[PDB]
């Protein structure tokens, strides 16, 4: 059958009945299953580990009783040094009226994923500069096995139960199992030394939480593995406006650096996300257009690979330039689109909604619509009111299978705009205050909120 | 053999790196009365 798999051990896959789905609908189910907040939801997408391709949020999955498919729910959009523990590097936070990027469930989810990446060699270890470095990398792998084990024990409330082999990359395990007996026993013993030294001495001596262990591990993947958080795409045809054997290039996309490229053998910068105006897909060909009329065109394997590429650029654009807008119709997320058609914000903090009313909704009845910060089933309406002396009130709107109803009501509507028209014919009240709805203060292009990530390059 | 950098937690703690999801926002009771013709 068709399943969405989780990297978390304690979690049952999603088993999908026959029917029609959106990738996004599935990612929403997935976040509910893994306790991922609406705020972190758009960091995740569906990945097919066999095809090596990501699904765009608007992709349709028609499931019958014949089809067999395994998708992984996976964190896709990533910002090096989100954790703030590398002092050589720009830190990366959300805007604030600066908060952390990840919620606790996202961190837990990422830890499971990162472990899987390391062991299954999706996150390949870096290459040695020397035999000395080679051994050094290998020791860092052992340390990683100590973090993994220590954390698993602190989670089950254990202490000294009773090896490293399943917690290190599989390629490296294979490598070690082919070395001489004394080598293999030496390695095992150094590992046992690290482990004992950590759990007796280091943990108590530094009050190390399961949270620090998760952070440390993921911060270490960044420096231990190759291009952690990057996606690299391979192409024959790369055309750039600014600038025989079939020549070969790589295009790399990262949250922190944007869209870079090189001759397949260092990286040239084409563009950060906010400078992009639009993206076009022509079968397998992708053109990325910048504000300065410069263009990158590239040709990928298939249209599905093109959609996977553009999903990524587009997701990072929403994260760094504009939370409410999209670059390419072909991968536009259905929720993004509908929100635009309805004047609705994403899960902005209440203070941003209030600030927008203090600026452009000064009269009684002016409102903001915003998705709830804590669940996926409700929209909030924030309204300017006055006593008889300006107040802000919040009213809950339920959304259930495309139906919209005020909280508690037996009356629902087939669209949000229907519900709003009906509400605009009433006198509303709460506490002592009565008023009628005036107009919607809609999302503005490029405005700043907690949905955006404040990276070095996003400041311009 | 020396402890790997991965197990060293000696350097200063930085800002907490994740957020706790906030308690659901409290909402106001909404009363409706039809507008008069």
Kindly describe this structure.
The complex is a heterodimer of chains A (460) and B (37). Chain A has 460 residues and is an alpha+beta fold. Chain A folds into 4 domains: 77 residues, Ubiquitin-like (UB roll) (Roll), CATH 3.10.20; 106 residues; 107 residues, PH-domain like (Roll), CATH 2.30.29; 92 residues, SHC Adaptor Protein. Chain A has a 5-stranded mixed β-sheet with strand order 2-1-7-4-5. Chain A has a 5-stranded mixed β-sheet with strand order 18-19-20-21-22. Chain A has a 4-stranded antiparallel β-sheet with strand order 10-12-13-14, with helices on one face. In chain A, helix 2 packs across helix 6, helix 3 crosses helix 5 and helix 3 packs antiparallel against helix 6. Chain A is globular, with a radius of gyration of 25 Å. By secondary structure, chain B is mostly beta strands. In chain B, 0% of the residues lie in helices and 16% in strands. Chain B has no helices and 2 strands. At the A-B interface, strand 9, helix 2, helix 3, helix 5 and helix 6 of A face strand 1 and strand 2 of B. Strand 23 of chain A pairs antiparallel with strand 2 of chain B.
Can you tag this structure with a few keywords?
heterodimer; A: 460 residues; alpha+beta; Ubiquitin-like (UB roll); PH-domain like; 10 helices; B: mainly beta; 2 strands; Tyrosine-protein kinase JAK1 (chain A)
Task: Give a brief rundown of this model.
By secondary structure, chain A is α+β, with helices and mostly antiparallel strands.
CATH C-level category of the largest domain in chain A: Mainly Beta
Count all strands of chain A and give the number: 25
| General form of chain A | globular
Number of helices of chain B: 0
The share of residues in extended strands of chain A comes to 25-35%
**Span of the ends, CA to CA of chain B:** 87 Å
Q: What is the ordering of alpha helices and beta strands of chain B?
A: EE
Family (chain A): Belongs to the protein kinase superfamily. Tyr protein kinase family. JAK subfamily.
Subcellular location (chain A): Endomembrane system
Protein name (chain A): Tyrosine-protein kinase JAK1
Subunit structure (chain A): Interacts with IL31RA. Interacts with IFNGR1. Interacts with JAKMIP1. Interacts with SHB. Interacts (via N-terminus) with IL2RB and IL10RA (via its cytoplasmic domain). Interacts with FER.
